[PDB]
Amino acid sequence: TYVQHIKRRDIVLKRELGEGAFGKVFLAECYNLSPTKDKMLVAVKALKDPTLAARKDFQREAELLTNLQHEHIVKFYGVCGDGDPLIMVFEYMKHGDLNKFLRAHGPDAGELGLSQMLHIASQIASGMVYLASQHFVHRDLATRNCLVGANLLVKIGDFGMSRVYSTDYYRLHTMLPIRWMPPESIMYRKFTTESDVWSFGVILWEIFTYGKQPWFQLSNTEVIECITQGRVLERPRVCPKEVYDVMLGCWQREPQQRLNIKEIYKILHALGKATPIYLDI
Ligand SMILES: Cc1c(C#Cc2cnc3cnccn23)cccc1C(=O)Nc1cc(N2CCN(C)CC2)cc(C(F)(F)F)c1
Numbered sequence: 573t574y575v576q577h578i579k580r581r582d583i584v585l586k587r588e589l590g591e592g593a594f595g596k597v598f599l600a601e602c603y604n605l606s607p608t609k610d611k612m613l614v615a616v617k618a619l620k621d622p623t624l625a626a627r628k629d630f631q632r633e634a635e636l637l638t639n640l641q642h643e644h645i646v647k648f649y650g651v652c653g654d655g656d657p658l659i660m661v662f663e664y665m666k667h668g669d670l671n672k673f674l675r676a677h678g679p680d681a682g683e684l685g686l687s688q689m690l691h692i693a694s695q696i697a698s699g700m701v702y703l704a705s706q707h708f709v710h711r712d713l714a715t716r717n718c719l720v721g722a723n724l725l726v727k728i729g730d731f732g733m734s735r736v737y738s739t740d741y742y743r744l745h746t747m748l749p750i751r752w753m754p755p756e757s758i759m760y761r762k763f764t765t766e767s768d769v770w771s772f773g774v775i776l777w778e779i780f781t782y783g784k785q786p787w788f789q790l791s792n793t794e795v796i797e798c799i800t801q802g803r804v805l806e807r808p809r810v811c812p813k814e815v816y817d818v819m820l821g822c823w824q825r826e827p828q829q830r831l832n833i834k835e836i837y838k839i840l841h842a843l844g845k846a847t848p849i850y851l852d853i
Pocket residue numbers: 589597614615617629632633636637640645646662663664665666667668669710719728729730731732
C-alpha cells in the first residue's frame with residue numbers, strides 16, 4: 573500500500589525517549605501534519621545507517637501500521653523519504669508505556685481503582701478483537717508494549733526488546749517473551765490468536781499486580797519448566813474472583829478451549845459496575 577509521505581524539514585526533535593532494535597525513539601514536533609498545519613507533538617523513530625534487514629523491517633512496519641487502523645492500535649502518521657536516517661512518525665502518547673504507568677501507581681511506588689483497571693483491560697481487549705478480525709497474530713502482547721494517553725486511553729503497540737537491561741526476553745536465534753507465552757508457543761513455536769489470548773490473560777495479571785513481572789520468583793529455566801508442566805500464575809490478592817476466572821479462561825492448556833477475545837471483551841464489559849461510554853459524537 574501507499575504510506576503517507578512526511579517531509580524531513582517538518583520534523584523537530586525535542587527529547588530522546590529510548591532505543592530498541594529498530595532505532596532511537598524521540599518526542600518531537602511536526603508541522604503540516606494537523607488539519608491546521610500548526611505544529612503538533614508526535615513520536616519519531618529514527619533508524620541510522622540501516623542494514624538491509626532493518627530496512628525491510630522498517631518497510632514491513634510502515635505498511636502494516638498503514639493497514640492496521642483502530643482506536644486501540646497505536647496510530648501511525650507516516651514515513652520520510654529514502655535516506656539516512658529512516659524516519660517513522662507516530663501519535664504521541666504522553667503517559668508512556670503501560671508497564672511503567674502501572675508501576676507508578678502501585679504500592680511499591682495515587683492508586684488505580686477496579687473500574688480503571690477494567691477499563692485498561694477492556695481497551696486492550698478491544699484492540700485485540702480488531703487484530704483477530706484482521707487475522708493478525710501479535711506474538712508479543714504485554715503491558716510494556718502498550719501506550720497510555722490522556723483520559724486513560726490505552727493502545728496496543730510493539731516496541732520489541734530494549735537496545736537498557738531487561739529480563740522479559742530469553743533465548744530459547746530469537747529472543748522470546750516466555751513469561752507471556754503458552755505451552756504450545758514455547759514448545760512448538762505455534763503462534764495463533766489463541767496464544768495471543770493466553771498473553772492477554774497474563775496482561776490481566778500484570779494490571780492487577782500493578783505491572784509486576786509474571787513469574788518474578790522464577791528463573792527463565794524455571795519459567796519454561798513451570799509453563800510446560802501446566803502451572804498457572806496465582807490470583808493476586810486484590811484481584812476479584814471473576815477477573816481471575818477470566819485469566820483461567822485464557823490459560824486453558826488446550827488452545828481451542830480458551831476464551832476467544834470477543835467473549836473476553838463482552839465479559840470484561842459486563843464485569844464493570846459503570847464501564848465508560850464510548851463516543852464518536
Ligand atoms: C508505537 C511504536 C513506537 C512509539 C511510540 C510512542 C508514542 N508516544 C510515546 C511516548 N513514549 C514512548 C513511546 N511513544 C516506536 C516504535 C514502534 C512502535 C510500534 O508499536 N510498532 C509496531 C510494529 C509492528 N510490527 C510488528 C513487528 N514488529 C517487529 C515490527 C512491525 C506492529 C505493531 C502493532 F501495532 F501491530 F502492534 C506496532
